[PDB]
Scaffold this motif. Structure first.
Motif, PDB file in Angstrom:
ATOM      1  N   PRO A 160      10.088   6.609 -16.896  1.00 41.12           N
ATOM      2  CA  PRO A 160      11.470   7.064 -17.099  1.00 41.12           C
ATOM      3  C   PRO A 160      12.031   6.649 -18.457  1.00 41.12           C
ATOM      4  N   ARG A 161      11.495   5.580 -19.038  1.00 41.78           N
ATOM      5  CA  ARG A 161      11.887   5.168 -20.379  1.00 41.78           C
ATOM      6  C   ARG A 161      11.482   6.236 -21.387  1.00 41.78           C
ATOM      7  N   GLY A 202       1.288  14.317 -22.125  1.00 39.76           N
ATOM      8  CA  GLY A 202       1.450  14.414 -20.689  1.00 39.76           C
ATOM      9  C   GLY A 202       0.301  13.974 -19.800  1.00 39.76           C
ATOM     10  N   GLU A 203      -0.930  14.074 -20.291  1.00 40.67           N
ATOM     11  CA  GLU A 203      -2.099  13.706 -19.484  1.00 40.67           C
ATOM     12  C   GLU A 203      -2.130  12.235 -19.024  1.00 40.67           C
ATOM     13  N   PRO A 204      -1.904  11.279 -19.943  1.00 41.12           N
ATOM     14  CA  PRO A 204      -1.887   9.871 -19.519  1.00 41.12           C
ATOM     15  C   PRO A 204      -0.700   9.500 -18.630  1.00 41.12           C
ATOM     16  N   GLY A 205       0.301  10.372 -18.550  1.00 40.56           N
ATOM     17  CA  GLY A 205       1.554  10.058 -17.880  1.00 40.56           C
ATOM     18  C   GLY A 205       1.437   9.614 -16.432  1.00 40.56           C
ATOM     19  N   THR A 206       0.278   9.852 -15.829  1.00 34.72           N
ATOM     20  CA  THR A 206      -0.005   9.368 -14.482  1.00 34.72           C
ATOM     21  C   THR A 206      -0.375   7.881 -14.529  1.00 34.72           C
ATOM     22  N   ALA A 242       0.812  -1.217   0.000  1.00 31.23           N
ATOM     23  CA  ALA A 242       0.000   0.000   0.000  1.00 31.23           C
ATOM     24  C   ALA A 242       0.849   1.273   0.000  1.00 31.23           C
ATOM     25  N   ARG A 243       1.767   1.369   0.959  1.00 32.00           N
ATOM     26  CA  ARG A 243       2.626   2.541   1.103  1.00 32.00           C
ATOM     27  C   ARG A 243       3.448   2.797  -0.156  1.00 32.00           C
ATOM     28  N   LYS A 244       4.000   1.733  -0.731  1.00 36.96           N
ATOM     29  CA  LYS A 244       4.766   1.866  -1.962  1.00 36.96           C
ATOM     30  C   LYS A 244       3.853   2.280  -3.105  1.00 36.96           C
ATOM     31  N   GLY A 245       2.597   1.850  -3.044  1.00 40.04           N
ATOM     32  CA  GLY A 245       1.630   2.249  -4.048  1.00 40.04           C
ATOM     33  C   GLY A 245       1.391   3.746  -4.030  1.00 40.04           C
ATOM     34  N   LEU A 246       0.993   4.262  -2.870  1.00 42.02           N
ATOM     35  CA  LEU A 246       0.703   5.686  -2.736  1.00 42.02           C
ATOM     36  C   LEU A 246       1.934   6.531  -3.035  1.00 42.02           C
ATOM     37  N   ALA A 247       3.084   6.100  -2.522  1.00 40.22           N
ATOM     38  CA  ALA A 247       4.332   6.821  -2.750  1.00 40.22           C
ATOM     39  C   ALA A 247       4.683   6.874  -4.236  1.00 40.22           C
ATOM     40  N   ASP A 248       4.690   5.711  -4.883  1.00 39.17           N
ATOM     41  CA  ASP A 248       5.000   5.638  -6.307  1.00 39.17           C
ATOM     42  C   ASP A 248       4.062   6.493  -7.148  1.00 39.17           C
ATOM     43  N   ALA A 305       2.082   9.070  -6.200  1.00 42.94           N
ATOM     44  CA  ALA A 305       2.281  10.473  -5.856  1.00 42.94           C
ATOM     45  C   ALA A 305       3.572  11.025  -6.459  1.00 42.94           C
ATOM     46  N   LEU A 306       4.543  10.143  -6.678  1.00 44.71           N
ATOM     47  CA  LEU A 306       5.795  10.512  -7.334  1.00 44.71           C
ATOM     48  C   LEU A 306       5.623  10.648  -8.848  1.00 44.71           C
TER      49      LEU A 306
END
Ligand SMILES: [Mg+2]
Ligand SMILES: [Zn+2]
Ligand SMILES: [Zn+2]
Lengths: 470, 1166
Positions: B929-930, B917-921, B772-778, B780-781
């Motif tokens: 990063p690729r 840029g919109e789909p980039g989330t 979960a934490r890695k999910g939210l962090a990733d 949000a990053l």
């Protein structure tokens, strides 16, 4: 070697100069004495310097000046001053008619009496400046006569100094050296109109100054040398005491000025100390310079260290208010009441709230407020000096209202009302002014106004305007 | 015609060095004192940082002394203290100066990375600084004696040299020295000599530096700046109101930091003059000079020497450089943001009753927003005497104002916006509907465009004040005018969740139900049958329908028939407009299908019918979903009965392999792989168990014994329709969920055996927490990463706008289906759709042209090409466009919110960047990063090397660090030998011929290569295919276009090979170059035309080069940009978007394109 940050490049650059021995101080001071007295003597040997002092004292007793602006006093009161100046004039009026060889013995004494006068620094400066500018006057003619021969008419300077030295006034050189049949001789004719006519001032200097072109150079040259010696010595001393300056400035650190600023003002203080010091009083130069440097530092700090400048007495007054706070803090167990230090202090005591206010330093407008964000103090300071648009639309609307309403009255009532007020016109006008402009005058207009105001008073004239008063 | 003198509407801008006399020209007085205000009467002390005389009056139209207080006396300079009585705003305008005693270096030109004073004099920095600090002596105009011109000496050395040479030798120190250097400098002579020296010796190291320097020199000459101006004689002071002393509450004052600095400078300067008049010793005045230098530097740009601190406060004082630069990385206020009047915001709610062209707005909000309009309209009708009374009326909120508000609101659109603005749909226009409440109501169909949930998300509102803004909002920003995502022609108005569950529940068929097998005349009596409760919503029934087909020429054909369908489908058919065939509604209506319905409807009937259709679909969706009674219970989630068995068997496997590790039959790691494999397989089994069960288990009887269809279970319908939920999450509800992996990434071999329907114990939950934490962090990053990417993208594109109509080039890229691996990862029809053919295409037989030359290929053209077998179409692209400084509409494509060809003047670079840029989330070497690496054109870690030239190759030399490769062309020479490290396993055959761009090794390859060796079309193809490989793998639809424009911006620069006009190796705009060679092929030189080579610059690199310097000052490092421009005297003509945005005039695009055009041609002409 260079770490930047000039605190260092200074600290190291001064550290080179070695501290003075107790004897070396006396050596330097002696050198000072030598230089100065040299320039004083050079001043005493100038006729114009004397005659000027006389012409000044003739303006002193004539109420065009005061005794303070001329002399700081002699080697010694207005009476004593009058008789001393009388002595001066006496030696002058003797030496003047004795010019006919034997005069010299008196011209020497004429210096001595003149050397009894301690001049105001300003006056002395005026004198020295006059001498040097006079030397500029000599140089003008020297270089004119030189360039008009050598550069223009093609004459060697080697042969140009021959008949120059010793005369440079009379026609012995000008009219008797052009017939010499030298390669440069017959060439001297082309400029002969320009050289002899400018000679007028050259021989004039021996009239005003009372010295031939010979002496005029010698005297003030000796003066220049003396000045040089003086400055040399004094500078040397200051450069020796810089360490003392820094040592002093270390105390005044956080008073609100930078370190190097402090040591620089202190340096100025030390310069003044060397200027006013006399080793003949047996007072150690260290403890004497200390006070001066400390004075420069303090006096400067009080003056320029604030965003808002405050008078000296006010500053000290603030400090006095701090002192009380200190003792009375722990003494009272919390702190003294805002009116406690009031009676504790001399003056009216209600001034506390006042004095305590103006003292505070303004908070930096760039002080960041919370969130660490670009929100900074000044960004939140609103403009209260601007006017709201909601009112600005009314200010434009009133101009329509009063316009229509003024279209209501008679043309002359409208003229009188538009005139009695500044309505759509430059300034406004007095009732008498409205009188002269209408050809009908005084009480008359004052009546027409009232009825006019009366016509705009009751509703349907008023109903439009009455809505404008909130 | 007299040109002009005073104020006009200005074009361009110029920037350069400042003359002392010019500095004085701005200055209306010299500030001679550090003092600010009197300390009692707060009036300014005369000749100070704050002053009435030099700058301006304290209060409006009033003298300081108070003599002339009347608005009449204006151009009057007061006799007492000269103050011309004029508005206080002039104190925000009039500048000042300070005459510095000793010369001073301007820290911007001393410490800028390529130190200007340094390279202009060809002198090192450390030397110059060593000279400035009086640490050493430097020569000037050495003449012929013993010494160089730029040579540096020391105390003793200077003394000895002087002893040897009295005159005809010159040396100074300090700022005066550097000034003397710059002033004595003769640029022209250096030009001549350097040209000669360039021409004489042949060495790379020599003539490289040589040509660079001569170019620099002549540039600085042509600027009009004289080197002396790098040293400040005079220091300008900023107007007092821009650094205010303004008071605060509690009688406290607050002032800027520029006052501390300026005050310091003034102080030290005056003290320097004082020390001069006192004939101080050298050391003292030197210390003072240095201190002055430091103070001035700290004023200009602080932090490049000592970082001076403000009074009583530790925090370093903000200098003018920081005033300009701003903060938050690079943000200059027109970037970070700006507060705006006539606006508002609040929490948002649903409002399904709304048509999609409108939205709800709170009463009070609309009142306060339209307040001026309300006033003017109140007194226009005569309800209010004057504006004042109007304010009193709306303040009292009298009953009469509401109707007036209803008047001013009617045809007046409003703008709505959300917080995470990405694509242009982030802001949309709506027609205000007055609503009682404090909440904003937002139409559900648009909730997809904003990416706005109902969980407390807030929206902001802006009022389109000017008429032009009203019409802009209505004809562009309007909701109904954008029904299609600008990224791809697919509708963004696609129904969301509740509605699709409604339409799904409607059309579907249970095996048996009321009215099964009966017949009805039309949809009317079908609905009438349903509502009365006689017939069930879902039953197999034949009914007569009338469907239309517009297949005639511009004309609707009508046909009727008995269709085998369901009651629900019959009822729903009433909505479907006109020429749509019944087939479309005869299916199960999933989210995809329900989208394709709208799509086809739009590509057939047009805009308006599509709009009303969509609206109706939403309404009926909500209504029937409501009637449906769909809910979710704890028993709605069905666990497999065989679960425990699968668990136990897979659990036997682990002890099998465990026993094997105990006996040593298998190693540790291999064991690990084994157990992890068996558990994974187990998860797959339980998943495909619960899936089959939950899916088809419904077993129901029609007239016979049994039969079974797809389940009517709630959670299933939800997941299947696409309303919400998915096989992945449903899997976690019923079956066991996955295996988790510790932060290290090592996947635990004891998966979660339980699920959410069951309980999770302590361990299982703890183990889930990390996921979960890695999910939210990733996530949000990756939001931030997306933002940064879009930023780089818009920065690199922006000003690219459609300008010319058609460049008219046959050029284009070959469009084939993607055909990856097995069958067709993406068809040909989508790749060529909405684009334009470069040239006419054939049938299997020829002299029959299906699509002529350049034509827009719409649905009919693409389906006509699909009828025929054509596998190959050459298509015009924005990358190959012949138009310089822009794209022609004929090259771009039709894509837009509207199906018609792209308009003239629309800004495509921006929308391209936004679309990328919109789909980039939604993106997960591979990944986001690729993508960032791709657009940056970074050479990978372990790349591959392509063959330099075609022809037979062989292995040369031996082993030192490399084993050389010798290429041998058929005809031409073979000097080409590349040094390939032999410790890398090769590919290329020692005995075989290799075409240029073949595989001489393995691994990814840098696109620089692909550009150079394989060509331009090749490299753009590589970029687009790879980035599309990244997006499409995530399920993201982005048309090739946008990527292609970004690509075009990447290759904007190229390096010349040949000569005859400009320099040899210069990287320059291919626009400039192509325009110059096309112009040089004829007239001019007969043909002198120079060859270039296309260059590939990364996005962040290509963003660096912009004509306009004001633009560069925005997103780049401001401090450097301003200087680097100011030396060359660069003249910014605007012409771009960003610059015109900063300067605050109409954008040279969109609506403003009719302006800037009618201007641009007027300029540089009659
Ligand atoms: Mg949300
Ligand atoms: Zn005045
Ligand atoms: Zn084109």
């Amino acid at each position: 070697g260079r770490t930047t940050d000039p605190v260092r490049m200074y600290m190291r650059e001064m550290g080179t100069v070695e501290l003075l021995t107790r004897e070396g101080e006396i050596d330097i001071a002696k050198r000072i004495e030598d230089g100065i007295n040299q320039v004083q003597c050079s001043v005493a040997e100038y006729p114009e310097a004397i005659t000027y002092l006389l012409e000044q004292y003739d303006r002193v007793e004539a109420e065009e000046a005061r005794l303070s602006d001329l002399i700081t006093g002699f080697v010694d009161d207005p009476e004593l001053a009058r008789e001393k100046f009388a002595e001066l004039r006496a030696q002058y009026v003797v030496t003047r008619d004795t010019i006919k060889a034997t005069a010299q013995e008196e011209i020497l004494k004429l210096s001595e009496v003149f050397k009894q006068f301690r001049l105001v620094p300003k006056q002395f400066d005026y004198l020295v400046n006059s001498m040097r500018v006079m030397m500029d006057r000599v140089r003008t003619q020297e270089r004119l006569i030189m360039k008009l021969c050598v550069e223009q008419c093609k004459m060697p300077k080697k042969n140009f100094i021959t008949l120059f030295t010793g005369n440079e006034t009379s026609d012995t050189w000008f009219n008797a050296a052009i017939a010499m049949n030298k390669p440069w001789s017959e060439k001297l004719h082309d400029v002969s109109e320009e050289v002899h006519r400018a000679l007028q001032k050259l021989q004039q200097i021996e009239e005003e100054t009372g010295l031939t072109i010979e002496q005029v150079k010698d005297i003030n040259r000796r003066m220049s040398i003396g000045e040089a010696k003086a400055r040399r010595a004094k500078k040397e001393m200051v450069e020796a005491n810089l360490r003392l300056v820094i040592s002093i400035a270390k105390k005044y650190t956080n008073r609100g000025l930078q370190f190097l600023d402090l040591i620089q003002e202190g340096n100025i203080g030390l310069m003044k100390a060397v200027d006013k010091f006399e080793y003949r009083r047996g007072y150690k130069f260290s403890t004497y310079a200390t006070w001066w440097i400390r004075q420069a530092i303090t006096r400067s700090i009080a003056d320029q260290a604030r965003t808002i400048r405050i008078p000296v007495h006010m500053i000290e007054t603030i400090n006095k208010l701090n002192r009380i706070s200190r003792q009375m803090l722990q003494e009272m167990g919390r702190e003294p009441t805002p009116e406690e230090l009031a009676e504790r202090m001399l003056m009216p005591e209600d001034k506390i709230r006042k004095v305590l206010k103006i003292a505070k330093e303004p908070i930096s407008m760039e002080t960041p407020i919370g969130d660490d964000e670009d929100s900074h103090l000044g960004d939140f300071i609103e403009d209260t000096t601007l006017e709201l648009p909601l009112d600005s639309a009314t200010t434009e609307s009133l101009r329509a209202a009063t316009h229509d309403v003024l279209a209501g009255l008679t043309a002359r009532e409208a003229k009188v009302l538009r005139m009695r007020f500044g309505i759509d016109m430059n300034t406004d006008y007095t009732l008498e002014e409205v009188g002269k402009q209408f050809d009908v005058t005084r009480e008359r207009i004052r009546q027409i106004e009232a009825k006019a105001l009366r016509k705009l008073r009751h509703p349907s004239r008023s109903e439009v305007l009455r809505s404008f008063l909130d | 015609l007299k040109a002009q003198t005073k104020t006009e509407e200005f074009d361009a801008i110029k920037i350069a060095l400042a003359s002392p006399d010019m500095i004085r020209s701005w200055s209306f007085g010299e500030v001679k004192k550090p003092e600010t205000i009197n300390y009692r009467t707060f009036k300014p002390e005369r000749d100070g940082l704050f002053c009435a005389r030099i700058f301006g009056p304290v209060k409006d139209y009033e003298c300081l002394c108070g003599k002339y207080k009347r608005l009449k006396h204006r151009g009057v300079i007061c006799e007492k203290c000269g103050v011309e009585v004029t508005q206080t705003k002039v104190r925000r305008e009039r500048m000042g100066h300070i005459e510095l005693a000793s010369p001073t270096a301007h820290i911007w030109f001393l410490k800028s990375l390529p130190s200007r004073i340094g390279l202009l004099l060809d002198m090192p920095l450390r030397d110059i600084e060593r000279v400035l600090y009086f640490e050493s002596y430097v020569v000037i105009e050495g003449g012929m004696t013993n010494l160089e011109r730029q040579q540096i000496l020391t105390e003793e050395q200077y003394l000895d040299a002087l002893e040897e040479f009295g005159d005809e030798f010159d040396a100074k120190m300090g700022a005066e020295a550097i000034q003397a250097l710059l002033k004595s400098m003769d640029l022209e002579q250096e030009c001549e000599q350097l040209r000669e020296e360039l021409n004489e010796t042949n060495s790379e190291t020599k003539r490289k530096k040589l040509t660079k320097r001569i170019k620099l020199l002549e540039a600085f000459v042509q600027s009009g700046n004289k080197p002396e101006w790098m040293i400040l004689t005079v220091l300008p002071v900023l107007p007092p109101d821009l650094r205010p002393l303004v008071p605060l509450d509690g009688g406290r004052f607050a002032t800027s930091d520029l006052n501390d600095l300026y005050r310091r400078v003034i102080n030290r300067n005056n003290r320097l003059k004082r020390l001069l008049d006192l004939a101080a010793p050298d050391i003292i005045v030197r210390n003072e000079k240095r201190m002055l230098q430091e103070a001035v530097d700290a004023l200009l740009d602080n932090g490049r020497r000592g970082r001076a601190i403000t009074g009583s406060n530790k925090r370093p004082l903000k200098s003018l450089a920081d005033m300009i630069k701003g903060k938050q990385g690079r943000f200059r206020q027109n970037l970070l943001g700006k507060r705006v009047d006539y606006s508002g915001r609040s929490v948002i709610t649903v409002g399904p009753y709304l048509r999609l062209h409108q939205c709800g707005l709170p009463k009070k909000m609309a009142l306060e927003l339209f307040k001026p309009f309300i006033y003017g309209k109140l007194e226009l009708r005569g309800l209010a005497t004057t504006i004042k009374a109007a304010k009193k009326m709306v303040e009292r909120e009298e009953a009469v104002v509401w109707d007036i508000l209803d008047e001013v609101i009617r045809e007046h659109p409003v703008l709505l916006n959300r917080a995470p603005t990405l694509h242009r749909l982030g802001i949309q226009a709506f027609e205000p509907v007055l609503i009682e409440g404090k909440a904003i109501q937002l139409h559900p169909l648009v909730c997809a465009a904003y990416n706005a949930d109902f969980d407390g998300d807030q929206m902001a509102v802006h009022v389109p004040l000017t008429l032009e803004a009203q019409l802009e909002a209505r004809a562009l920003m309007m909701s109904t005018n954008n029904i299609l995502s600008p990224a791809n022609g697919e509708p963004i108005i696609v129904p969301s969740q509740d509605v699709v569950l409604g339409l799904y529940y409607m059309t579907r068929d249970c095996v048996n139900a009321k009215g099964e097998g009966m017949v009805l005349t039309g949809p009317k009596e079908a609905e009438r049958l349903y509502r009365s409760g006689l017939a069930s919503l879902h039953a197999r029934v034949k009914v007569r329908i009338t469907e239309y087909e517009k297949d005639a020429n511009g004309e609707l054909v009508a046909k009727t028939s008995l269709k085998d369908t369901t009651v629900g489908r019959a009822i729903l058919w009433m909505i479907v407009p006109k020429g749509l065939p019944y087939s479309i509604v005869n299916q199960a209506l999933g989210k995809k299908a329900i989208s394709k319905m709208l799509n086809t409807c739009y590509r057939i009937l047009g805009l308006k019918p599509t709009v009303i259709f969509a609206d109706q679909i939403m309404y009926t969706g909500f209504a029937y979903a409501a009637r449906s009674g769909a809910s979710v219970g704890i028993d709605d989630m069905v666990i497999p009965e065989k679960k425990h068995e699968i668990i136990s068997e897979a659990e036997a496997e682990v002890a099998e392999i465990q026993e094997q590790f105990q006996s040593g039959l298998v190693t540790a790691g291999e064991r690990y792989n084994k157990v992890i494999d068996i558990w994974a397989a187990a998860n797959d089994r339980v998943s495909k168990a619960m899936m089959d069960n939950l899916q088809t288990e419904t077993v129901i009887n029609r007239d016979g014994q049994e039969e079974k269809q797809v389940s009517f279970n709630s959670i299933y319908m939800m997941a299947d329709s696409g309303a919400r939920g998915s096989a992945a999450q449903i899997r976690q509800l019923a079956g066991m969920r996955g295996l988790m992996a510790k932060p290290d990434g090592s996947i635990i071999e004891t998966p979660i055996t339980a699920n959410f329907r069951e309980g999770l114990n302590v361990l299982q939950y703890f183990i889930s927490t990390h996921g979960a934490r890695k999910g939210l962090a990733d996530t949000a990053l990756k939001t931030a990463n997306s933002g940064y990417l879009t930023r780089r993208l818009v920065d690199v594109a922006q000003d690219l706008v459609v300008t010319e109509d058609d460049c008219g080039t046959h050029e284009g890229i070959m469009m084939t289906p993607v055909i990856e691996g097995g069958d067709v990862k993406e068809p040909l029809r989508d790749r060529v759709l909405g684009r334009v053919t470069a040239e006419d295409v054939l049938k299997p037989g020829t002299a029959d042209i299906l699509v002529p030359r350049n034509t827009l290929l719409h649905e009919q053209w693409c389906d006509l090409l699909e009828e025929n077998s054509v596998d190959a179409v050459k298509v015009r692209s924005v990358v190959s466009c012949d138009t310089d400084f822009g794209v022609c509409a004929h090259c771009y494509g039709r894509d837009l919110a509207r199906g018609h060809i792209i308009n003239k003047g629309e800004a495509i670079g921006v929308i391209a960047a936004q679309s990328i840029g919109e789909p980039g989330t939604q993106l997960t070497t591979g990944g986001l990063p690729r993508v960032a690496d791709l657009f940056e054109a970074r050479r990978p870690k372990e790349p591959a090397i392509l063959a330099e030239i075609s022809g037979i190759v062989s292995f040369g030399k031996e082993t030192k660090g490399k084993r050389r490769l010798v290429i041998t062309p058929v005809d031409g020479s073979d000097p080409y030998e590349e040094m390939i490290p032999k410790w890398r396993q090769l590919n290329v055959f020692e005995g075989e011929r290799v075409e240029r761009g073949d595989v001489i090794s393995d691994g990814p390859e840098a696109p620089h290569d692909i550009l150079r060796l394989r060509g331009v079309h090749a490299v753009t193809r590589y970029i687009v295919n790879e980035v599309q490989d990244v997006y499409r793998l995530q399920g993201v639809k982005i048309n090739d276009k946008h990527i292609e424009v970004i690509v075009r911006q990447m290759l904007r620069k190229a390096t010349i090979v040949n000569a005859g006009s400009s320099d040899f190796l210069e990287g320059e705009q291919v626009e400039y170059s192509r325009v110059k060679i096309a112009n040089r092929e004829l007239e001019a030189n007969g043909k002198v035309g120079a060859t270039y080579s296309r260059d590939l610059l990364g996005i962040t690199k290509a963003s660096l080069a912009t004509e306009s310097f004001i633009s560069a000052a925005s997103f780049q490092e401001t401090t450097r940009v301003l200087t680097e421009a100011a030396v060359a005297g660069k003249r910014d003509e605007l012409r771009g978007l960003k610059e015109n945005v900063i300067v605050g005039r109409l954008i040279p695009a969109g609506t403003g394109y009719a302006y800037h055009q009618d201007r641009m041609r007027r300029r540089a002409a009659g």
